[PDB]
Design an enzyme around this catalytic site. Structure first.
Site, PDB file in Angstrom:
ATOM      1  NE  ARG A 147      -6.858 -10.624   8.612  1.00  0.00           N
ATOM      2  CZ  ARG A 147      -6.287 -10.187   9.347  1.00  0.00           C
ATOM      3  NH1 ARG A 147      -6.737  -9.167   9.462  1.00  0.00           N
ATOM      4  NH2 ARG A 147      -5.299 -10.017   9.154  1.00  0.00           N
ATOM      5  NE  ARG A 179       6.610  -5.160   7.832  1.00  0.00           N
ATOM      6  CZ  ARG A 179       6.965  -4.748   7.788  1.00  0.00           C
ATOM      7  NH1 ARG A 179       5.821  -3.935   7.132  1.00  0.00           N
ATOM      8  NH2 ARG A 179       7.796  -4.238   7.680  1.00  0.00           N
ATOM      9  CG  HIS A 194       7.665   8.013   2.133  1.00  0.00           C
ATOM     10  ND1 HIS A 194       7.414   7.632   2.554  1.00  0.00           N
ATOM     11  CD2 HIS A 194       8.279   7.390   0.783  1.00  0.00           C
ATOM     12  CE1 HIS A 194       8.504   6.337   2.966  1.00  0.00           C
ATOM     13  NE2 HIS A 194       8.976   6.791   1.546  1.00  0.00           N
ATOM     14  N   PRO A 195       9.651  10.569   3.717  1.00  0.00           N
ATOM     15  CG  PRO A 195      10.723  10.183   6.177  1.00  0.00           C
ATOM     16  CD  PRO A 195       9.278   9.831   4.735  1.00  0.00           C
ATOM     17  CG  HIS A 220      17.216   5.282   7.200  1.00  0.00           C
ATOM     18  ND1 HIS A 220      16.595   4.271   8.174  1.00  0.00           N
ATOM     19  CD2 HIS A 220      17.177   5.502   5.905  1.00  0.00           C
ATOM     20  CE1 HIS A 220      16.236   3.215   6.921  1.00  0.00           C
ATOM     21  NE2 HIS A 220      16.478   3.481   6.055  1.00  0.00           N
ATOM     22  CD  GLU A 221      15.572   8.588   4.256  1.00  0.00           C
ATOM     23  OE1 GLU A 221      15.613   8.722   5.467  1.00  0.00           O
ATOM     24  OE2 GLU A 221      14.823   8.494   3.083  1.00  0.00           O
ATOM     25  CD  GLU A 257      15.596   0.930   4.248  1.00  0.00           C
ATOM     26  OE1 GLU A 257      15.620   1.000   5.136  1.00  0.00           O
ATOM     27  OE2 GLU A 257      15.407   1.607   3.348  1.00  0.00           O
ATOM     28  CD1 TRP A 315      -3.322 -18.422   7.959  1.00  0.00           C
ATOM     29  CD2 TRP A 315      -1.392 -18.308   6.777  1.00  0.00           C
ATOM     30  NE1 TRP A 315      -3.160 -17.246   8.543  1.00  0.00           N
ATOM     31  CE2 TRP A 315      -1.723 -17.088   7.494  1.00  0.00           C
ATOM     32  CE3 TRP A 315      -0.209 -17.845   5.674  1.00  0.00           C
ATOM     33  CZ2 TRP A 315      -1.115 -15.438   7.159  1.00  0.00           C
ATOM     34  CZ3 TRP A 315       0.629 -16.952   5.571  1.00  0.00           C
ATOM     35  CH2 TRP A 315      -0.549 -15.583   6.534  1.00  0.00           C
ATOM     36  CE  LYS A 369      -0.540 -15.285  11.513  1.00  0.00           C
ATOM     37  NZ  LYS A 369       0.401 -14.191  11.663  1.00  0.00           N
ATOM     38  CG  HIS A 377       5.282  -6.123   2.082  1.00  0.00           C
ATOM     39  ND1 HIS A 377       5.224  -5.181   3.282  1.00  0.00           N
ATOM     40  CD2 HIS A 377       6.137  -5.353   1.089  1.00  0.00           C
ATOM     41  CE1 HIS A 377       5.454  -4.459   2.921  1.00  0.00           C
ATOM     42  NE2 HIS A 377       6.515  -4.941   2.315  1.00  0.00           N
TER      43      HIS A 377
END
Ligand SMILES: *[C@@H]1O[C@H](CO)[C@@H](O[C@@H]2O[C@H](CO)[C@@H](O)[C@H](O)[C@H]2NC(C)=O)[C@H](O)[C@H]1NC(C)=O
Ligand SMILES: *[C@@H]1O[C@H](CO)[C@@H](O[C@@H]2O[C@H](CO)[C@@H](O)[C@H](O)[C@H]2NC(C)=O)[C@H](O)[C@H]1NC(C)=O
Ligand SMILES: *[C@@H]1O[C@H](CO)[C@@H](O[C@@H]2O[C@H](CO)[C@@H](O)[C@H](O)[C@H]2NC(C)=O)[C@H](O)[C@H]1NC(C)=O
Ligand SMILES: *[C@@H]1O[C@H](CO)[C@@H](O[C@@H]2O[C@H](CO)[C@@H](O)[C@H](O)[C@H]2NC(C)=O)[C@H](O)[C@H]1NC(C)=O
Ligand SMILES: *[C@@H]1O[C@H](CO)[C@@H](O)[C@H](O)[C@H]1NC(C)=O
Lengths: 576, 48
Positions: A120, A224, A296-297, A325-326, A353, A428, A432, A456
């Protein structure tokens, strides 16, 4: 190009992309003279709307190139950042290799704290001014397009209008999100308390029994996902979980049997056979030669009657789940194959998804493994194995909900100017503490920029897709085998030998974007909004187990403890 | 005389390994040192 890496392929990318973008822009400019409030036929009005966006072209040219340069700079600095040990600055580490492995494997308090602080302190400090100006540029661009802010532009994805009472106002999304999170909070509280109690043994004298958790002990860079804590939170380590990795080894399962078994499962469910052309013009297994290709699929939507999948085969269950999934993505792709190009997509961002997740989950049940024959019928699994599997699933599902909600709320509140620029970071961290219940190990002033460290955030991506889809999946669960008259536990749901579930699924698959997602929800689930009750019903046994196990505990936390308050000194100054 | 040199081995073993480690450290840091521009601190340049 994915099959063959050449410079000619790269310039073909450049030429084809430029040609496609120029064609889109010229078609939009040509069609912009058609008025909107005159065509009452909706299936063409949707195409007109989807081609009518003027995009960033409304913004000034110098501003446009400045914005593009800033975005490229952000992507480059995120991809090429590096920090390293002060003791030996001659060896330095990137983020993707090593550092992620360190935070996912290390058990040292000091090492994790150092890595978390250094990343950070050496990335967000650089990223802060760029974001501080990027938000202003995006706000101006959005305001130039009859939108309150860029957050409104993002929320416009779910906006539906002029369909006689099925409309969904953009502001209604916030209300739904808060109402859903309100019912989620009690379960997350119990799970967090249990996790704190379990972590009390691994890091003694570092965690308060009533305080929040330190950030640098979550198994991930930002938290995450909580899967990496599974080894430190196993309820019953005496018995192992469900593993069949040696089953395919015993039968000598090559890297071709996976797709054939998936096709057989689909046939048993009720879906039709698969295209031989797809079998030919695809990439079932990596060649393994000197020609580099990404493992990567990914499923492809070439159209015209041909599709393909790119993924590197291997004898392991995760490959089977990814293949399912695919394959679900590919089925959804042919589902709208008889639709216009503007409608050759899902209802929204959270639809592609959601199908693969339920498809993989239906085949992931131990009942399916027993039915296949890999798991022998005589063997049985007790309640503890189910508890372990449910906890493993929860550590991935539940963990991301408060994080996603908090991140999206912060972005929305910062895009509408409700937060002063000099009061970002503080606010922020407050969230948290009070939403997620995580406290930072060291204070961060306003010079830092913590959320900009996430991929992201620093790449102009909407994070809400991971939230609603997560709900839809479980809601789809209630629409998936409840109609198929499944009476056992919800975590044992399967749909083999159930053509009614297949028909119900196909009824919504064969729609594309021609109808609102609310219409699809009413058609299959029967509601006109996202519901959280299916998720609560799914984890009821584990909820009861946690409630039983949390009797000698303190559910909740206090947003005042910190790992540095015990050794801090307070100062008081009175100038006047 | 050319074969009579007792050499640096006359020192203690711990001091010998300390000296060897330090010489190796000097060589490594000289070979792998790098500085770069604060304007774009992502690309950095070696000496050679
Ligand atoms: C809206 O306009 C479209 C464009 O013509 C109509 O879609 C066609 O409908 C005709 C018969 O009405 C069919 O023969 C075509 O196969 C359809 N496809 C095309 C060309 O888009 C649609 O019917 C109109 N909406 C109505 C009147 O319901
Ligand atoms: C974006 O599209 C709209 C289409 O209306 C453009 O707005 C029009 O601009 C022209 C001149 O460029 C005027 O003659 C019209 O009166 C405007 N219509 C309105 C106000 O909707 C807008 O200029 C386009 N922007 C760009 C640069 O693509
Ligand atoms: C659920 O897992 C536990 C694991 O022991 C078992 O249930 C308990 O088993 C012990 C010893 O057999 C006893 O306390 C009781 O038989 C059970 N405790 C209760 C009912 O409170 C059992 O293997 C599994 N099934 C049940 C119904 O508990
Ligand atoms: C319902 O569908 C299943 C899905 O496989 C089928 O199971 C077959 O028959 C028996 C088990 O019933 C197995 O030995 C075969 O290997 C399965 N192969 C087939 C034909 O799919 C069967 O059609 C039905 N059996 C149930 C209720 O599972
Ligand atoms: C097509 O599906 C039918 C019904 O399951 C089956 O009898 C036939 O063998 C399948 N053929 C192919 C191409 O797999």
């Amino acid at each position: 190009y994915n099959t063959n890496i050449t410079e000619e392929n790269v310039q073909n990318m450049n030429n084809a992309g430029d040609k496609w973008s120029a064609f889109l822009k010229e078609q939009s400019t040509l069609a912009q003279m058609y008025p909107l409030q005159e065509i009452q036929n909706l299936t063409v009005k949707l195409q007109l709307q989807a081609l009518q966006q003027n995009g960033s072209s409304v913004l000034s040219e110098d501003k446009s190139k400045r914005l593009n340069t800033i975005l490229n700079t952000m992507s480059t600095i995120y991809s090429t950042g590096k920090v390293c040990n002060p003791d030996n600055p001659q060896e330095c580490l990137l983020l993707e290799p090593g550092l992620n492995e360190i935070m996912a494997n290390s058990l040292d308090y000091n090492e994790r704290l150092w890595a978390w602080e250094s990343w950070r302190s050496e990335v967000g400090k650089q990223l802060r001014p760029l974001y501080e100006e990027y938000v202003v540029l995006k706000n101006e661009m959005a305001r130039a397009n009859h939108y309150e802010d860029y957050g409104d532009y993002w929320r416009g994805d779910y906006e539906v209008n002029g369909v006689d009472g099925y409309d969904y106002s953009r502001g209604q999304l916030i209300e739904d999100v808060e109402h859903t999170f309100e019912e989620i909070k009690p379960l997350y509280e119990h799970l967090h308390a249990y996790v704190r109690a379990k972590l009390m043994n691994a890091y003694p004298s570092y965690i308060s029994p009533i305080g929040c958790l330190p950030a640098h002990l979550l198994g991930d860079m930002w938290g995450r996902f909580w899967t990496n804590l599974y080894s430190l939170t196993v309820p019953f380590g005496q018995k192992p979980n469900i593993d069949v990795t040696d089953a395919m080894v015993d039968q000598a399962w090559d890297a071709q049997r996976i797709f054939k078994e998936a096709e057989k499962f689909f046939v048993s469910v009720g879906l039709p056979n698969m295209t031989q052309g797809f079998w030919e013009n695809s990439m079932l297994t990596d060649p393994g030669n000197v020609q580099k290709a990404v493992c990567h699929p990914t499923a492809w939507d070439l159209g015209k009657g041909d599709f393909r999948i790119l993924m590197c085969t291997k004898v392991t269950m995760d490959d089977f789940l990814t293949a399912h999934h695919e394959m679900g993505h590919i089925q959804y792709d042919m589902a709208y194959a008889a639709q216009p190009f503007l409608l050759r997509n899902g209802a929204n961002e959270g639809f592609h998804e959601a199908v693969g997740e339920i498809m993989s989950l239906s085949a992931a049940t131990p009942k399916h493994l027993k039915s296949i024959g890999l798991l022998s019928p005589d063997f049985q699994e007790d309640n503890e194995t189910e508890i372990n599997f449910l906890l493993k699933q929860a550590l991935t599902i539940v963990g991301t909900l408060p994080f996603t909600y908090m991140l999206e709320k912060w972005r929305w509140m910062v895009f509408k100017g409700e937060i002063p620029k000099d009061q970002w970071m503080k606010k922020w961290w407050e969230m948290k503490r009070e939403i997620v219940g995580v406290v930072e190990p060291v204070p961060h002033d306003e010079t830092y920029c913590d959320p900009a460290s996430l991929f992201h955030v620093s790449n102009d991506y909407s994070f809400i897709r991971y939230y609603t889809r997560t709900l839809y999946q479980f809601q789809f669960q209630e629409a998936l085998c409840q109609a198929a008259k499944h009476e056992g536990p919800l975590h044992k749901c399967d749909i083999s030998n159930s053509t009614e579930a297949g028909q119900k699924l196909f009824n919504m698959l064969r729609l594309g974007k021609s109808e609102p997602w609310t219409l699809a929800l009413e058609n299959v689930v029967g509601a006109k909004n996202m519901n959280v009750r299916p998720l609560l019903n799914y984890f009821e046994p584990l909820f009861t187990w946690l409630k039983d196990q949390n009797k000698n505990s303190f559910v909740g936390w206090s947003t005042d403890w910190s790992p540095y308050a015990d050794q801090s000194i307070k100062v008081r100054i009175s100038l006047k």
